């Protein structure tokens, strides 16, 4: 059981733009404090995919790390631009949220935002006047995903799904016969230059390395940035120690150490199988959307 789930790779910024009032606990997320945009992701069995890759980036972290661009416009308040993509997707929102965010068909981060002192309804399709104690200060993640930087081009990858006629907002072909319809929890991936790519099967492998996002460092725990640590035969502001993998690359001072650095288990470069070929995605996730299959 991992004690450094809140010790985030990259910057660890979990806030959406224009909701700035829990920055002290969300910018960055770390061991202490509560974050309405992040904490829900760590509750048991609520976000299974992200919990198996918890040392990879959240959607919000990926936005603030410039891995994912913000949609244009970035919010929408509740009728036309949103709610097309939002209405094909079936989601439950806890009470007291003013905002909720998702990866859209273009691979950008979109959000739905309620007016001041309004909250999202349980299905996140409407806003209603504040019932309850207090609006939360963050945004609710509507998808189960994780992200990483990638240069791998996917300008040629398009959703391919056997017998599927429509999945979400994407119509894959013309079906003239009658269709069966269902809300399905569907795996998807997003690549450099690709649109959202829905998949029949999610198939992933991790390749481990010794890059900075493969370690977590800590001084009651406090977060420590590993960029302060000098690599072997190189310069750095602080003194560090760690496991053997760390000491294989950075300088290790068992007596004068400020921080310790362990390997972040599960970290590494993630790859996904797309039509038989292994490709490195920007984000991978699950989404509950309308799917239409031929009969």
């Amino acid at each position, epitope marked *: 059981e991992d004690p450094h789930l809140r010790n985030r790779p990259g910057k660890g910024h979990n806030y959406i733009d224009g909701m*700035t*009032q*829990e*920055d*002290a*606990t969300c*910018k*960055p997320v770390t061991y*202490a*404090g509560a974050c309405s945009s992040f904490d829900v992701l760590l509750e048991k069995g609520k976000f299974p995919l992200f919990q198996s890759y918890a040392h990879h980036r959240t959607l919000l972290e990926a936005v603030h790390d410039t891995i994912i661009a913000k949609a244009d416009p970035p919010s929408c308040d509740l009728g036309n631009p949103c709610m097309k993509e939002k209405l094909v997707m079936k989601t439950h929102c806890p009470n007291d949220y003013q905002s909720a965010h998702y990866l859209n068909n273009d691979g950008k981060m979109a959000s739905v935002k309620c*007016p*001041p*002192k309004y909250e999202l309804t349980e299905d996140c399709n409407f806003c209603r006047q504040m019932t309850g104690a*207090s609006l939360k*200060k963050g945004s609710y993640p509507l998808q189960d995903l994780f992200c990483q930087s990638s240069e791998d081009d996917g300008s040629k990858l398009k959703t391919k799904m056997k017998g599927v006629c429509e999945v979400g907002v994407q119509a894959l072909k013309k079906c003239d016969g009658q269709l069966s319809t269902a809300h399905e929890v569907v795996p998807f991936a997003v690549f450099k230059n690709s649109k959202k790519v829905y998949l029949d099967k999610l198939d992933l492998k991790t390749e481990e390395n010794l890059l900075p996002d493969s370690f977590v460092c800590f001084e009651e725990l406090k977060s420590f940035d590993i960029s302060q640590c000098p690599k072997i035969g190189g310069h750095g502001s602080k003194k560090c120690t760690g496991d053997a993998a760390f000491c294989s690359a950075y300088e290790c001072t068992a007596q004068y150490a400020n921080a310790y650095c362990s390997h972040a288990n599960g970290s590494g470069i993630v790859q996904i199988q797309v039509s038989g070929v292994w490709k490195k995605p920007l984000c991978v996730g699950y989404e509950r959307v309308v799917v239409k299959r031929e009969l």
Partner: antibody, heavy 118, light 106 residues
Framework: QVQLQESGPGLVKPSETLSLTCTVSGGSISTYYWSWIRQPPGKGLEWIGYIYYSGSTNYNPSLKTRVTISVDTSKNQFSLKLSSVTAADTAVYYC????????????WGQGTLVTVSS | LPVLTQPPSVSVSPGQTASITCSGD??????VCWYQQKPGQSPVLVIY???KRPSGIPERFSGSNSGNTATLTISGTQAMDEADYYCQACDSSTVFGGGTKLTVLG
């Protein structure tokens, strides 16, 4: 249970820099917002800025060019610097704590009077 | 930069109902806090989030906010309640009101 205690000189010459320190007791800097607020004799309240443990800040835009707020978690205090000071800066300076960045001030210090005079 | 306007000087006879107003454009979209200050001491939070009361504050204190106007009301005002009252936009772009001195007559 927290107590906030402002300390600093009571006299600052014009154009010089004003400096204050708030010491938190019976509590910690932790994840709260720590704010400086001032009140000119006989006048209303004005918010100067806040800081939180990471060192990130946010200043009143009327004052941002002359304000520095800094934090010292190891000593459980935080500080205000207000530069090129003027007679308009004569005031009681308060430190205050809030839970979130909406700045609901539920704990206040006692206030220090700083007079600007030659 | 925002400005909230209160009246200086509200007057009320004991046991009656004092009402402090605080105005600004679309103030009803922001959450409002109220503070009471008595001679020589620090402000004390009396109302937060337009209408909530901190633990330990007499229930005769209530508040409301709608349109361009927030209101702090004391029912059955005592001599105890002679003080200055400040409203604040305890929301994104924070600002205080100019303050209201409350004199309780008789």
């Amino acid at each position: 249970q927290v107590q906030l205690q402002e300390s600093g000189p009571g006299l600052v010459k014009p154009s010089e820099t004003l400096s204050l320190t708030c010491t938190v007791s019976g509590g910690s800097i932790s994840t709260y917002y720590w704010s400086w607020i001032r009140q000119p004799p006989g006048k209303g309240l004005e918010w100067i800025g806040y800081i939180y443990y990471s060192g990130s800040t946010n200043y009143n835009p009327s004052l941002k060019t002359r304000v520095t707020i800094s934090v010292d978690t190891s000593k459980n205090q935080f500080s205000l610097k207000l530069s090129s000071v003027t007679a308009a800066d004569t005031a009681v300076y308060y430190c205050a704590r809030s839970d979130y960045g909406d700045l609901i001030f539920d704990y206040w210090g006692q206030g220090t009077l700083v007079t600007v005079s030659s | 930069l925002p400005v909230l306007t209160q009246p200086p000087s509200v007057s009320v006879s004991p046991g009656q109902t004092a009402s402090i107003t605080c105005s600004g454009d679309k103030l009803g979209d922001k959450y409002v806090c109220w503070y009471q200050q008595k001679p020589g001491q620090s402000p004390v939070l009396v109302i937060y989030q337009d209408s909530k009361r901190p633990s330990g504050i007499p229930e005769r204190f209530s508040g409301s906010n709608s349109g361009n106007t927030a209101t702090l009301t004391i029912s059955g005002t005592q001599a105890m309640d002679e003080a200055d009252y400040y409203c604040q936009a305890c929301d994104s772009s924070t600002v205080f009101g100019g303050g209201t001195k409350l004199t309780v007559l008789g």
